[PDB]
Write an enzyme that holds these catalytic residues in place. Sequence first.
Site, short mmCIF file in Angstrom:
data_model
loop_
_atom_site.label_atom_id
_atom_site.label_comp_id
_atom_site.label_asym_id
_atom_site.label_seq_id
_atom_site.Cartn_x
_atom_site.Cartn_y
_atom_site.Cartn_z
N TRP A 133 36.92 46.57 35.41
CA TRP A 133 36.97 46.00 34.06
C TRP A 133 35.55 45.43 33.91
CZ3 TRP A 133 38.61 40.77 31.87
CH2 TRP A 133 38.63 40.80 30.47
N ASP A 214 44.27 40.19 39.86
CA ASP A 214 44.17 40.20 38.38
C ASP A 214 45.44 40.96 37.91
OD1 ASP A 214 43.28 40.27 35.61
OD2 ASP A 214 41.52 41.47 36.22
N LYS A 250 48.89 41.69 26.54
CA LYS A 250 49.45 43.09 26.45
C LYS A 250 50.93 43.20 26.61
CE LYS A 250 44.79 43.33 27.54
NZ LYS A 250 44.73 43.95 26.12
C1 LIG Z 1 41.83 44.44 33.75
C2 LIG Z 1 41.79 43.21 32.84
N1 LIG Z 1 41.73 41.88 33.24
C3 LIG Z 1 41.74 40.89 32.21
C4 LIG Z 1 41.81 41.22 30.83
C5 LIG Z 1 41.73 40.06 29.82
O1 LIG Z 1 42.47 40.10 28.69
P1 LIG Z 1 42.85 38.80 27.91
O2 LIG Z 1 41.80 37.72 28.20
O3 LIG Z 1 42.99 39.10 26.48
O4 LIG Z 1 44.21 38.05 28.27
C6 LIG Z 1 41.85 42.57 30.45
C7 LIG Z 1 41.88 43.00 28.99
N2 LIG Z 1 41.03 44.28 28.89
C8 LIG Z 1 41.00 44.95 27.48
O5 LIG Z 1 42.32 45.11 26.87
C9 LIG Z 1 40.24 46.25 27.51
O6 LIG Z 1 40.18 47.05 26.50
O7 LIG Z 1 39.65 46.54 28.58
C10 LIG Z 1 40.44 43.96 26.42
O8 LIG Z 1 41.60 43.10 26.24
C11 LIG Z 1 39.10 43.28 26.75
O9 LIG Z 1 39.34 42.04 26.50
O10 LIG Z 1 38.02 43.88 27.18
C12 LIG Z 1 41.88 43.51 31.48
O11 LIG Z 1 41.99 44.91 31.35
#
Ligand SMILES: Cc1ncc(COP(=O)(O)O)c(CN[C@](O)(C(=O)O)[C@@H](O)C(=O)O)c1O
Lengths: 401, 401
Positions: A133, A214, A250
């Site tokens: 990520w 994670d 999600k």
């Molecule tokens: C692997 C991973 N860890 C943590 C998070 C954090 O998410 P949040 O802070 O909203 O609770 C994401 C979200 N990754 C994405 O959906 C993505 O398209 O990779 C996007 O939400 C991002 O925030 O970059 C993730 O894929």
Amino acid sequence: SSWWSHVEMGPPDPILGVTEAFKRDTNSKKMNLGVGAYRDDNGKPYVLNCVRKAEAMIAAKKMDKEYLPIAGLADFTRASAELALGENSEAFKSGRYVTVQGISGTGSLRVGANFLQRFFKFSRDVYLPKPSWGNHTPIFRDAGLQLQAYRYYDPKTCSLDFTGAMEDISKIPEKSIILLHACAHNPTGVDPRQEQWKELASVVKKRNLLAYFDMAYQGFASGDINRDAWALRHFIEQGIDVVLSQSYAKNMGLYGERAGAFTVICRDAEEAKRVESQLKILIRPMYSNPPMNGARIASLILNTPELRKEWLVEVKGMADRIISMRTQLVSNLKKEGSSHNWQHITDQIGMFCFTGLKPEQVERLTKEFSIYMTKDGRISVAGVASSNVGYLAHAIHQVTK
Amino acid sequence: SSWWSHVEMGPPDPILGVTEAFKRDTNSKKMNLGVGAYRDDNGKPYVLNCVRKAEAMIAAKKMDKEYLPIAGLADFTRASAELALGENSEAFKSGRYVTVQGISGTGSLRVGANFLQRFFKFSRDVYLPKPSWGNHTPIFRDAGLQLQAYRYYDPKTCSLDFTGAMEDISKIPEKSIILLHACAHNPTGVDPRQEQWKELASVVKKRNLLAYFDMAYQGFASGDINRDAWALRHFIEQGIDVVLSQSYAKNMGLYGERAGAFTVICRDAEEAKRVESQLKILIRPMYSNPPMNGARIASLILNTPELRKEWLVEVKGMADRIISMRTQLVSNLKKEGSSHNWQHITDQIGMFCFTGLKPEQVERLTKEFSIYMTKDGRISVAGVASSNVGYLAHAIHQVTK
Ligand SMILES: Cc1ncc(COP(=O)(O)O)c(CN[C@](O)(C(=O)O)[C@@H](O)C(=O)O)c1O
Ligand SMILES: Cc1ncc(COP(=O)(O)O)c(CN[C@](O)(C(=O)O)[C@@H](O)C(=O)O)c1O
């Protein structure tokens, strides 16, 4: 020469920056396949049914908006600990854990990374899989740690490099930190097999590494929550005290309400009591106390039997649908006449597909078809509906033809 | 010897920690006078009328929960800039400002402090008044800067040490950072007189200091918002490019929904465009994007004429009421037979009263009467209702008798 004259123009976010450009496009056919976000089969934002009803009860309750304790709403705090750990859990049942509400996954990650910067006295090194990520680097690097890598994907093959993984892993210096994604590894969608997982468990235990999990996709990998937390629980029951970060962005579609949690598996209840004190102190000079709406929506669902049931029916509904689109994708490709092997589309799990497209192909997709995805070739299949599966497929085919 | 065995027990928050202890007390007469939180005249949490109606429209609108851009909801972003600056403003009207939604006041403060740590190339020193909001230290100190002080309160007198203030101020090294509270200086409730303010303006301009304004109480000092932002606007029109932090926690009673904003006054529109890019990059590895509910409630009120009006009627209602309790307080003291001079109660402005009580007196108030306030003698009069004004007064009298 003002205060900020020296301040240069930074670039747009690699993922987030894709929705900003998507937004400006005038193509009535544009698709936003870049952030990991769920769309229904009409390709519309989906606010889950148990969410809509949990809001109405809060509403109906006429609740106040008073500041929450620094660690968050207790019920939410405890309901996550439990959803991550399983109710029969010795860790959970002994109370040797400390869960703090965080600003979703990102925000739990950072409080954690900042916890490690401050109390993780044995190393400044965090080993991330190859690839990971994209936000995991800056998260850890602004927090103050150093970044390293262990081999994970095998692009000649479109799967895990399990040999290369355990070679790098069995050689990481003792007491280092290793980030492992719970399930629905992002961006690859290839997870260790349960078998593989028992083996990693061994080496981590044996090298004495701080395992940081994670878990942003719980229930998206198999369509079952308990199954998706196997790995984490297998770890902890092997006697590995991990730290973890959870997102409800999600699996509950709470994206911008931001509800998430950071947990530490400790030795006793008493140590738990002291890591908490210290996590609070860390969080007070940060944002002081956390965002109440997501935390309150999640808690009412996690804790009200019928809301818990309705939510799992709906999580399953979501998993299935991504599946149906993977399926339908590969098939229009054949149908369009692709010669390529697209078997990874259907093989991969979670919200994405790590397609293999190169950057010129990504670039023309954007420009001839208004199909936005990240330049690493990642697309969010989560966001394809019955009505544009055909469009994407033809596009993928044209630029790949 | 586990990972966290060395991790010691930290103390409870100096302010926040008071609500935790208040919570456990079984005295049916307990009063929580420690955090700055508003209670109605029945001493109940007050969720404003325009808030309740703004929620219903969001509700009714059936809105999605999709991630917000990294800097926040635009309308909210722009409505705050404007509420802080005035609509006629040359800064505002030229677009030379960048406002980012933050995690309330605390959270805007920290993104800012972290902005200064990273791009404020002329100094690591932040001068805070004597005394200041206890959280201002750790905010700045975890961010990476150094802490200093300038004289502000005069406890022999119960007012500003204006001579001592301008001596310290006229001697701060050039290009240093000075924190100044917009209005309703916390914890003193004594603000520079407009006259005093024109003079500070001069020295700040003359020593070339980066002025950082904390505006957590806009509309609580005089019961008028525009009046309460005079000082900030006087600065900027003198040609001082300040940075600022705003909270909607208190004036909109959005406490735990967390809505707030961090702004930078820049040179042109173009510099604004570059400080933004860089603030985003800073915020992405933090919590990624901000909490949507408060931001959405605030925006609908700031931007819908009737909601804006209803909100100012209600802000005024709140200011008046604190006043009525100051008044009523001093009078039961006389009535109880206090010999002391309590004139500062009624003289001070905002949500608190900087009483002068010593720690033994605070300690018995807590223990004989279940009256919780901070150990610096600060009480939150905001939280006194018609029905316990008499109780507090007798208590204050007994322990002061
Ligand atoms: C692997 C991973 N860890 C943590 C998070 C954090 O998410 P949040 O802070 O909203 O609770 C994401 C979200 N990754 C994405 O959906 C993505 O398209 O990779 C996007 O939400 C991002 O925030 O970059 C993730 O894929
Ligand atoms: C002067 C000052 N600056 C910033 C804030 C931050 O507030 P928030 O992050 O919620 O938007 C407060 C709140 N000070 C307190 O009301 C108080 O009792 O001092 C309390 O809210 C606190 O958080 O300590 C404040 O008084």
